[PDB]
Structure formats: C-alpha cells, structure tokens
Coordinates of C-alpha atoms in Angstrom, one line a residue:
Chain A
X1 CA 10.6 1.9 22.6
X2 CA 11.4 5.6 22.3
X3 CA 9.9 6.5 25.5
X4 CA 11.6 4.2 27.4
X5 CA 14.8 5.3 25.6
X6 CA 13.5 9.4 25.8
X7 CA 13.1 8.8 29.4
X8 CA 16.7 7.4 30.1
X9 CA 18.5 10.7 28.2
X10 CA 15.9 12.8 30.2
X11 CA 17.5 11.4 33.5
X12 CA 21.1 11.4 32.4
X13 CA 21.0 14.7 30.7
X14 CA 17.8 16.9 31.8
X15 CA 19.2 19.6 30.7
X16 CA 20.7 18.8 27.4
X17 CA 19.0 20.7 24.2
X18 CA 16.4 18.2 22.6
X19 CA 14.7 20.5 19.8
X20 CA 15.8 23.8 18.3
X21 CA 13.1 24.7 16.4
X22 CA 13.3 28.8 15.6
X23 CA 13.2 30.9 18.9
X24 CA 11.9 28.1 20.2
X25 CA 14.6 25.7 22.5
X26 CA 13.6 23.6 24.5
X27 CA 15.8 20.4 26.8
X28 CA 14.6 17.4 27.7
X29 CA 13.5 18.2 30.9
X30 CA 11.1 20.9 29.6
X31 CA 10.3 18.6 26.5
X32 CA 9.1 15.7 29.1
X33 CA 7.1 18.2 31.6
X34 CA 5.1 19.4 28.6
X35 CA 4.8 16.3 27.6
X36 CA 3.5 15.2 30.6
X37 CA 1.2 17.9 31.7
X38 CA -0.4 17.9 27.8
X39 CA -0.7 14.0 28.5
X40 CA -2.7 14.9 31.9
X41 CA -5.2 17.2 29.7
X42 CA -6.1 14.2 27.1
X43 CA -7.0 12.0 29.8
X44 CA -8.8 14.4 31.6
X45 CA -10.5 15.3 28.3
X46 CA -11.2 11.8 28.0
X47 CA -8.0 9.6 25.9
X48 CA -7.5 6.0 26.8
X49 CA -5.8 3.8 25.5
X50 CA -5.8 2.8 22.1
X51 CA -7.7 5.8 20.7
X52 CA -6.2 8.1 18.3
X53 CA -5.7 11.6 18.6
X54 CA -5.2 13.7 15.7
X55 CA -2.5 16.2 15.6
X56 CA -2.5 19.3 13.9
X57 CA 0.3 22.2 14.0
X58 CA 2.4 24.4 12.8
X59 CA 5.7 24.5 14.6
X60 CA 7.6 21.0 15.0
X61 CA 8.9 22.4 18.9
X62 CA 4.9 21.8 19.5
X63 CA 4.6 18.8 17.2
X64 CA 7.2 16.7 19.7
X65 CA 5.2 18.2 22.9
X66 CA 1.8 16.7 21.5
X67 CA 3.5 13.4 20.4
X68 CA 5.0 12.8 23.4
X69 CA 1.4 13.3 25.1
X70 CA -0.2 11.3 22.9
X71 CA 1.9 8.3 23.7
X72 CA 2.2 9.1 27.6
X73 CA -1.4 8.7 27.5
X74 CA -1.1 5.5 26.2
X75 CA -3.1 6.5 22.9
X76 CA -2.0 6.6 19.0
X77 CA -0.7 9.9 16.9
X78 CA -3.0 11.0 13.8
X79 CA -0.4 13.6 12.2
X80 CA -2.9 15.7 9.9
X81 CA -1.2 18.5 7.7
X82 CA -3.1 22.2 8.5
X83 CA -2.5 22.5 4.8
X84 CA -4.5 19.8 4.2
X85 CA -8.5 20.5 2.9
X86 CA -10.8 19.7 5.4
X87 CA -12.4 17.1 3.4
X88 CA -9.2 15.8 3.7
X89 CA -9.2 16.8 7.3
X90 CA -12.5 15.8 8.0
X91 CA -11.8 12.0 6.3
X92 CA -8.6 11.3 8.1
X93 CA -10.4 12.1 11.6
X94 CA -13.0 9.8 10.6
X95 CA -10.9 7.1 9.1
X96 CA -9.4 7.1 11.8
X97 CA -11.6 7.3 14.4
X98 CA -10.3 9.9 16.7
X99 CA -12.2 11.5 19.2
X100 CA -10.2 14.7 19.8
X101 CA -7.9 16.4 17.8
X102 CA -5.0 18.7 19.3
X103 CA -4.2 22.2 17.5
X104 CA -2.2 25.2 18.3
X105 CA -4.1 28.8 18.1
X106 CA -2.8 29.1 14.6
X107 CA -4.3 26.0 13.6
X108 CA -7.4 25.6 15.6
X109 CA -9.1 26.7 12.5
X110 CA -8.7 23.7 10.8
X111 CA -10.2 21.4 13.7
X112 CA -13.8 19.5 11.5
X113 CA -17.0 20.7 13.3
X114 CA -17.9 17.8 15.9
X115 CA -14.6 17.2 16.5
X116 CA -13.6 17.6 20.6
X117 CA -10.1 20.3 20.5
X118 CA -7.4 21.2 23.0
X119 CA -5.4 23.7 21.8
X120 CA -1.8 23.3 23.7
X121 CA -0.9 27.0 23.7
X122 CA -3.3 28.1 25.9
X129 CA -1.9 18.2 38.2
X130 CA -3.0 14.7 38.1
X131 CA -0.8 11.8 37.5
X132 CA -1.4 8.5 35.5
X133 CA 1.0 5.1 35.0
X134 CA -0.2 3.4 31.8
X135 CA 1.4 0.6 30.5
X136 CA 1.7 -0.4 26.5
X137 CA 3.0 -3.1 24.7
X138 CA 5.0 -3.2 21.4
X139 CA 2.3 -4.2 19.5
X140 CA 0.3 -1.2 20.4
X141 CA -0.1 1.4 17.5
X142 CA 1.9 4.7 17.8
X143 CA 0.9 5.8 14.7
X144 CA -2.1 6.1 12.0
X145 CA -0.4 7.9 8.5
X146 CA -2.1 8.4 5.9
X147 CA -1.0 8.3 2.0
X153 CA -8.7 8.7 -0.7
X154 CA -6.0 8.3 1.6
X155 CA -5.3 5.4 3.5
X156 CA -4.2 5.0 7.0
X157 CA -1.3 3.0 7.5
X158 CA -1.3 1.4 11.2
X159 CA 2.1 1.5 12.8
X160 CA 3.0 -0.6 15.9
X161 CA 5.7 0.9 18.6
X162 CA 7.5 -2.4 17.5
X163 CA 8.1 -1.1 13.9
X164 CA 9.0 2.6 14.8
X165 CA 11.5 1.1 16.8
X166 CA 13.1 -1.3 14.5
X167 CA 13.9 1.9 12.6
X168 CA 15.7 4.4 15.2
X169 CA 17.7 0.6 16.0
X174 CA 23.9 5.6 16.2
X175 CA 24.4 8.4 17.4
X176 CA 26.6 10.4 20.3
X177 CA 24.9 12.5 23.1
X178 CA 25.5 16.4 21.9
X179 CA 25.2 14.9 18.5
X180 CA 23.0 17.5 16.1
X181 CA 20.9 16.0 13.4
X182 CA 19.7 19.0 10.9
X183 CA 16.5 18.5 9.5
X184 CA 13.8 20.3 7.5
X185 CA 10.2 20.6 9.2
X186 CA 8.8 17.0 10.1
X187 CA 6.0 16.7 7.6
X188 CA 2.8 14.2 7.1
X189 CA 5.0 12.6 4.6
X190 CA 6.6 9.0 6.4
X191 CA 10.0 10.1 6.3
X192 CA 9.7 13.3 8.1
X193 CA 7.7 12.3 10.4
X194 CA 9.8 9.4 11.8
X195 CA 13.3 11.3 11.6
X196 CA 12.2 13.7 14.6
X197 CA 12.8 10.5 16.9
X198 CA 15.9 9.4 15.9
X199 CA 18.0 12.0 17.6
X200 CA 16.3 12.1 21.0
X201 CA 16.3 8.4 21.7
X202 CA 20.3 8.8 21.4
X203 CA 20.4 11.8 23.2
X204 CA 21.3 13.9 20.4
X205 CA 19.4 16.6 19.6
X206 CA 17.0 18.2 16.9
X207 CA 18.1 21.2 14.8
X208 CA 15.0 22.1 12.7
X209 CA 15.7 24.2 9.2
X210 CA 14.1 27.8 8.8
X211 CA 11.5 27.2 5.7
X212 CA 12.8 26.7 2.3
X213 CA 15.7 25.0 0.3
X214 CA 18.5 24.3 2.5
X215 CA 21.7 26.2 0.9
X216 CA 25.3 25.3 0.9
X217 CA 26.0 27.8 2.9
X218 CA 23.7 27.0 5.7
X219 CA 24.5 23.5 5.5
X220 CA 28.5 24.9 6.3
X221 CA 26.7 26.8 9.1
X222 CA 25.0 24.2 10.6
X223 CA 28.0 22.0 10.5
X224 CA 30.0 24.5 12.1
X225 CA 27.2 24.6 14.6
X226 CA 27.9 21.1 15.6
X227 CA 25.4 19.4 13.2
X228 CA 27.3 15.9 12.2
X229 CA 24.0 14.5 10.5
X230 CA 21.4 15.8 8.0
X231 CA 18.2 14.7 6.8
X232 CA 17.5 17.1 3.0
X233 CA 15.0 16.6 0.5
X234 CA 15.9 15.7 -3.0
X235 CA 16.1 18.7 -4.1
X236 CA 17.7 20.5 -1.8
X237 CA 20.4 17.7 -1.9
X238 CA 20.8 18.3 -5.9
X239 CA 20.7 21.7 -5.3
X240 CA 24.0 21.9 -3.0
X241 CA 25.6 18.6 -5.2
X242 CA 25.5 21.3 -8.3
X243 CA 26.6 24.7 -6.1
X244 CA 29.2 22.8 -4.0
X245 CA 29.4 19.7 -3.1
X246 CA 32.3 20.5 -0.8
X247 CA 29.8 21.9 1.4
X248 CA 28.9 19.0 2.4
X249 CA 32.0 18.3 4.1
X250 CA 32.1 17.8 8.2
X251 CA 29.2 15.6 7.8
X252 CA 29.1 11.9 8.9
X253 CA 25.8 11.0 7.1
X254 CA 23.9 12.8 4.8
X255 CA 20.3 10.9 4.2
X256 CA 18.0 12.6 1.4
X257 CA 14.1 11.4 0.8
X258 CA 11.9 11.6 -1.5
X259 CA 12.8 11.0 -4.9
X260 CA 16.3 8.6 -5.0
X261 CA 18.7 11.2 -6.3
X262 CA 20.3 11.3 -9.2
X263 CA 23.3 9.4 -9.2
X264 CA 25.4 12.1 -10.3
X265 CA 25.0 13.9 -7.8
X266 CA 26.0 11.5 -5.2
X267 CA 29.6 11.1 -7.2
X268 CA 30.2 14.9 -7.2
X269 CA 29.7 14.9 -3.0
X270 CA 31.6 11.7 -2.6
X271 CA 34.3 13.0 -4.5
X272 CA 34.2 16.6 -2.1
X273 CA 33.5 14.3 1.4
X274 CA 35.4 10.6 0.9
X275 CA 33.9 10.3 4.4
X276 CA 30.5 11.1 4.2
X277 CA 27.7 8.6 3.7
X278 CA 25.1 8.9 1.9
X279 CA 21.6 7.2 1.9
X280 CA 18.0 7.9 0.5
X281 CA 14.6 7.0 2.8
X282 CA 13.0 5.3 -0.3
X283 CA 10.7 3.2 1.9
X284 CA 7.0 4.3 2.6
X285 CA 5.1 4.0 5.7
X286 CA 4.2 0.6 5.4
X287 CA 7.6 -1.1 5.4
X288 CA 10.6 1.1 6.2
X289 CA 13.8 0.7 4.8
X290 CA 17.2 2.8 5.1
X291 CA 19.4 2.4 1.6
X292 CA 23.2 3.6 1.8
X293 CA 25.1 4.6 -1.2
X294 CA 28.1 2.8 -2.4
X295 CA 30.1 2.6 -5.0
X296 CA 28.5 -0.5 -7.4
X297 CA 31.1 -3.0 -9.0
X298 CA 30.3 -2.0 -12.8
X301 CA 29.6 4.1 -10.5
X302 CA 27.7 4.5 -7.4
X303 CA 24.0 2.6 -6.6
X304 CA 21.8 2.4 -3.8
X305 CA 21.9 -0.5 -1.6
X306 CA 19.5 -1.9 0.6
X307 CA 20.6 -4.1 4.0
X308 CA 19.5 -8.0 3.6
X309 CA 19.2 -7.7 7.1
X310 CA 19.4 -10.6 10.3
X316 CA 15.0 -9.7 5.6
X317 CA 14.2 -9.1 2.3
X318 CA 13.1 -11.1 -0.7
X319 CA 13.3 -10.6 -4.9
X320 CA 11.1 -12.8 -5.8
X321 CA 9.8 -13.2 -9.3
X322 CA 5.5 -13.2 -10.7
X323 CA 5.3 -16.7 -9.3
X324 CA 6.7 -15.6 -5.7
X325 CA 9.5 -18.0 -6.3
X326 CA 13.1 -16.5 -5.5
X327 CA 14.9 -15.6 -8.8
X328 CA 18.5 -16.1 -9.3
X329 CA 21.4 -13.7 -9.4
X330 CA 21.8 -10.6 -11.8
X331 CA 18.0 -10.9 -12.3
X332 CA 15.6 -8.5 -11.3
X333 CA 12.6 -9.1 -9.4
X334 CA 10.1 -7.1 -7.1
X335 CA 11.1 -6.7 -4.0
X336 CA 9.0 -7.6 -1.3
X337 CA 10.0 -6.9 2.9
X338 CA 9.7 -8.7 6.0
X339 CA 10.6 -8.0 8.8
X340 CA 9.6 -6.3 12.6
X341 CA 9.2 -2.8 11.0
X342 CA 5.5 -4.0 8.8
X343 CA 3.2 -2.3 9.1
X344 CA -0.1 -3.7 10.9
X345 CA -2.1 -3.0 7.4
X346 CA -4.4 -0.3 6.2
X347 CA -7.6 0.6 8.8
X348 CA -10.4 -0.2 7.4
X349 CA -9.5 -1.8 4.2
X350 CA -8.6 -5.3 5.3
X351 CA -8.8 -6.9 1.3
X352 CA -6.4 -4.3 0.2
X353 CA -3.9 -5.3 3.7
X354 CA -4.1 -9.0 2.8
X355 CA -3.2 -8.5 -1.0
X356 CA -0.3 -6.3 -0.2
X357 CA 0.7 -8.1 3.0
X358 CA 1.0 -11.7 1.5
X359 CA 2.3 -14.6 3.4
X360 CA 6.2 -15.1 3.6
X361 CA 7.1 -18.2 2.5
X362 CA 10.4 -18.1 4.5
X363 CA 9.1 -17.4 7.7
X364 CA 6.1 -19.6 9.6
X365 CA 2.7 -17.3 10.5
X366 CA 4.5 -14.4 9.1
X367 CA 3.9 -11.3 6.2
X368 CA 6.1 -9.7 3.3
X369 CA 5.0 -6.6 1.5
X370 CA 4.9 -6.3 -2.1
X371 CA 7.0 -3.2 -2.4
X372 CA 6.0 -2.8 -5.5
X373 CA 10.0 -1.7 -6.3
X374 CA 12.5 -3.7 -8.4
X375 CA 15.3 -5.0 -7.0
X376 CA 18.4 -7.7 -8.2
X377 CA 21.3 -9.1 -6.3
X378 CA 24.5 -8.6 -6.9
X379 CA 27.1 -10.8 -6.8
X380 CA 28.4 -10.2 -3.8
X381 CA 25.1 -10.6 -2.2
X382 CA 24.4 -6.9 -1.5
X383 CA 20.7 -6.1 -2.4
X384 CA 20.4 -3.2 -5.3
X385 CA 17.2 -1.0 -6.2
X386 CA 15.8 -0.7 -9.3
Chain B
X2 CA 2.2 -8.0 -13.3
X3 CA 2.1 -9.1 -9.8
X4 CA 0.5 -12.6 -8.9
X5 CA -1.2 -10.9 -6.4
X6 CA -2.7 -8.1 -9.0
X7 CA -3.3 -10.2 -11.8
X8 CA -7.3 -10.6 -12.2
X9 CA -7.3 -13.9 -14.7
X10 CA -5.6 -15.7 -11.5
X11 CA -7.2 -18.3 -9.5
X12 CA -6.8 -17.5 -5.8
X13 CA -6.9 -18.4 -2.0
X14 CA -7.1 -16.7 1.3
X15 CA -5.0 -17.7 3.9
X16 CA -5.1 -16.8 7.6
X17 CA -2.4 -17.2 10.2
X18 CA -2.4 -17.5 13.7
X19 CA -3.1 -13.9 14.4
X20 CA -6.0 -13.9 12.3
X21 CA -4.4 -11.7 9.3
X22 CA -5.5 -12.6 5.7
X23 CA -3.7 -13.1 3.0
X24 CA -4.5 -13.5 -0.5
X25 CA -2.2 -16.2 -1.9
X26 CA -2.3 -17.4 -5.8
X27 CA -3.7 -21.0 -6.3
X28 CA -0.6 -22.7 -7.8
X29 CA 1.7 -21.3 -5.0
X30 CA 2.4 -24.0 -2.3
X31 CA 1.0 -22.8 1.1
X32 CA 3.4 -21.3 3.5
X33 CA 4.1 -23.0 6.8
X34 CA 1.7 -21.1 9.7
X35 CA -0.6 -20.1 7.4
X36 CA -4.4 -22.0 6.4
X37 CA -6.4 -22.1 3.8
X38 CA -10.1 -20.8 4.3
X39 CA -11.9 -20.0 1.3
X40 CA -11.4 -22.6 -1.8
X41 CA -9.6 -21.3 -5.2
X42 CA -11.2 -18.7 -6.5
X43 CA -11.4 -15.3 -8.4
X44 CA -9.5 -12.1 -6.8
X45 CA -12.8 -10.3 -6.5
X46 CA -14.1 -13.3 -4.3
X47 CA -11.0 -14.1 -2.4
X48 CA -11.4 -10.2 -1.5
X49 CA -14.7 -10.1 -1.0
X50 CA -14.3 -12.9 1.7
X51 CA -11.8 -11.0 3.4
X52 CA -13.8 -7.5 3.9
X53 CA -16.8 -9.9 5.3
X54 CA -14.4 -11.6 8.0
X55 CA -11.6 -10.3 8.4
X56 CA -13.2 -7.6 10.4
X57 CA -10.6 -6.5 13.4
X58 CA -7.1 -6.1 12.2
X59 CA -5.4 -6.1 15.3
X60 CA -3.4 -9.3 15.8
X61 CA -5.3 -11.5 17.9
X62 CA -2.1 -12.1 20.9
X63 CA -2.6 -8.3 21.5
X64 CA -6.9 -9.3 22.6

C-alpha cells in the first residue's frame, strides 16, 4: 500500500527530497502536509469514499500533492490530460462519475461546466480506513476506464536505496507514466522529473552525475541516445524505456557501452502490468517477461501449447485490473476465467508470446 | 483469432464467487470456482446477458 509505505519514509526521513520537479522541490514532510491539508479541502467540499476525483494539471510537483489527497480521503484518482478536448474531458468526468474535479490556475480552464472545482494553488482532521480492494485509480485508454485496485498498484512498486534518484520524464495519462511517480517514494528514493523534451546524452550524464542511478525514457529518447552514445548511459543500474519495445539494436549498442546496466521496456497496459528485462536470448538480445510465483501462452482453444510455439499470452495475477466501468460484456470477454487457478481471471493480452527452453517467457 | 473474439463460436457465461462474468467458449471444460449461467449460445447473447446482470463490477467480498 503506498501510503502506508509513503508514510514510513515520511517518519524516518521528513526531510529527505521526494520530488524535484523544476524550481519546484519539495521533501516528504512538505509533500505529506499538502497532501494532507488538500485531503481536508475534498472532504470539506464533499469526497467520501469511493468517489472519484478527477485530476487535472500541469506540473507533476502538484500532480503528487493532489494524488496523495485523493487517496487520504479515501477516494479514487481520475488523471485527465489538460491537453485533452473537453469532449474528451467532459466523457471521462462522466464515465467516471466524479463529482469534483481538481485543477491548478493554469488549468482551471479546462474544468466541463457542471463540474464542482478546487483549484490547489490558491484545519480539520479525518482517519479513513481502505482496503486493498479499494480502487486507486480510473485510466482511461471512446475511451475506456480501466478500474485499478490499491492491491494491483502495489504488486507493481513490489528495490531501491533511500537517496536513490529515479529520472523520469513528466508522468503522463498514458499507464506507464503514471504509475512510475510511486515507485521511488515508497522506497524512499526520490523523484527527479525531466525539463520538457527528448532527454539527451548529455543530460542523461548530468543526471547521473547528479546522483540519478535509475531512469524511466520513452522510446525514442532511448534510440535517440543508443545512436549518439550509448556510453552515456553508463552509471546507471536500470534503464526502463515504454512505449514502443525498442529496437533490439539499440539495446546491444548500450549493453555493449554499460555490461552493468539493465535494461527493460513497460510493455504492459493498464489493465494487466507487467515489467520485461532484457537479456541476451540463446539464438542476440530479447525481451523477457517473469513467469512469476503467473502467466499463460495458451493457444485458440485456451489449452497450453508446448515449447518453441507461440501462443497469446494471457496474465494472472494480483496486479488485474478490476475491468472496464461501465462496460461489463467487454470486462468478461477480456477477463476470461483461468483455468489454473479456482474463482480466478487471466487477461487476453492480446500479445504473442513462446517459451523458451529454459523456461524464461519471450514476447512476440 | 481468439476463442473469445471469434463470432461463429458457440458460448457460455460463467460467474465466480465475486460475481464477475466471464465469457467462456462452449467446448472449453469449465474452470474450477466458476458456474455456468446462461446455456451455450452466440457471442452477441452471451454478452448481451452480461450487460443486463452483471450490473455492479465491484467484487462482491468488498459489499
């Protein structure tokens, strides 16, 4: 649970750096009384638990306050995109069913007419208490809005050292963004947020120099610094990409600059989440997914398929997904009984997969 | 194709202890913790079933 875990580094080390976004620094003290006192103002303005607030701004510093809130309030995080259009907007608050949306001055334009806003720029105390199978999180691919439980957002963060720095472009509505922010605070760590546009060797040798050991890059950035230099690279203990998987290639040249690093690509959506590490395949390098203590290639008549043949893959596990609000025929078609386990779900990924023969699990 | 796409497929819905659906092909052998509730039948049925009952998608142990 990453509150439970945000709360521990927040007694330990109050006054440790949580998020560097721009001028903006804040510690985990001053990231938890923001937090807090934001949380006070959606009761107040009338969150309990179980509703979903909608979340709306520009700089991530403010995107962790109004999380944090969200969650202290007991309630679940709508992460809308000011880019977004408002029919967009307008949908997603309605899908959704979120009575208030939260906004920053910048983006307060973007709040749908009939729609209740606090805007945090501009005490009382509660004690809720949640269970795991309470939803943090509504995102949204017309879109649809995938319903996360706490239990599955914390599969994913369950390592890294307090003082630990994890560079990462601006979380995003896209899944993998949005997830990363927690990673480093439940550890202690702390955020380093990248000035807008491609990161570049050069500030990827600052940032390691700054103390960053971990980054988070979009493909292209990644390809971008493979090609220029992929001893840039070096100092770093993982290097995770998302988006598109990147070109193989590319992940040779930097493995050849950095024997050390590892590297893995976020390939899973919101639904079902999965981390895939690099390694070098027995044939060359491939993506390789953890089995897990799970995950099943199964072939069109859902019955396992053999060795060396590919199937699609389909994932079970804690991290699925509740399904999709609203659309409860599409949830049961894509979130099919597991044969394996009694009373239990796989989803289709949709993604081929094969085994190898050492057992490690391969994309394709 | 998928089983679970394929429209010329006869099918079942299923329903677990927590009350989630899931469509299931009709020659597949029924999972352990699942039931059967609506008989084989086309996808469009099966799925029209489920967005008549299956109405609250919260799992049931969480009231």
């Amino acid at each position: 649970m990453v509150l439970e875990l945000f709360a521990r580094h927040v007694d330990r080390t109050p006054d440790a750096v949580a998020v560097v976004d721009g001028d903006r620094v804040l510690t985990y003290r001053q990231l938890d009384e923001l937090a807090g006192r934001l949380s006070g103002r959606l009761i107040s303005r009338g969150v309990r638990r179980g509703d979903r607030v909608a979340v709306m701004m520009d700089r991530s510093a403010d995107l962790l306050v109004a999380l944090l809130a969200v969650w202290k309030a007991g309630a679940a995080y709508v992460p809308v995109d000011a880019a977004y259009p408002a029919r967009r907007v307008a949908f997603m608050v309605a899908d959704s069913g979120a009575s208030l949306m939260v906004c920053s001055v910048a983006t307060r334009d973007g709040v749908p007419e009939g729609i209740e806003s606090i805007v945090v720029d501009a005490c009382d105390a509660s004690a809720v208490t949640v269970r795991p199978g309470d939803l943090a999180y509504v995102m949204y691919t017309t879109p649809k809005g995938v319903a996360v439980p706490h239990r599955s957002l914390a599969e994913l963060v369950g390592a890294m050292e307090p003082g630990e720095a994890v560079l990462m472009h601006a979380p995003y509505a896209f899944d993998a963004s949005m997830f990363e922010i927690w990673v480093p605070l439940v550890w202690g760590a702390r955020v380093v947020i990248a000035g807008p546009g491609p990161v570049d060797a050069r500030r990827l040798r600052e940032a390691v120099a700054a103390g960053v050991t971990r980054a988070y890059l979009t493909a292209g950035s990644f390809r971008a610094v493979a090609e220029e230099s992929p001893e840039s690279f070096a100092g770093l203990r993982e290097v995770q990409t998302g988006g598109d998987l990147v070109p193989a290639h590319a992940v040779e040249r930097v493995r050849e600059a950095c024997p050390r690093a590892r590297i893995r690509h976020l390939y899973g959506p919101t639904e079902a989440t999965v981390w895939a590490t690099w390694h070098l395949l027995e044939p060359v390098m491939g993506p390789v997914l953890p089995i897990g203590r799970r995950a099943h290639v199964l072939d069109e008549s859902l019955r396992p398929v053999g060795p060396g043949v590919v199937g699609e893959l389909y994932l079970s596990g804690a991290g699925l997904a509740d399904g999709y609000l609203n659309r409860a025929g599409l949830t049961a078609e894509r979130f099919v009984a597991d044969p394996s386990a009694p009373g239990k779900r796989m989803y289709r990924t949709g993604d081929l997969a094969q085994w190898t023969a050492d057992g490690e699990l391969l994309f394709a | 194709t998928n089983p679970f796409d394929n429209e010329d497929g006869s099918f079942l819905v299923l329903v677990n202890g927590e009350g989630q659906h899931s469509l299931w092909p009709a020659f597949a052998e029924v999972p352990d913790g699942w039931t059967g509730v609506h008989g084989p039948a086309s996808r469009q049925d099966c799925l029209g079933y489920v967005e008549q009952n299956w109405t609250d998608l919260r799992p049931k142990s969480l009231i």
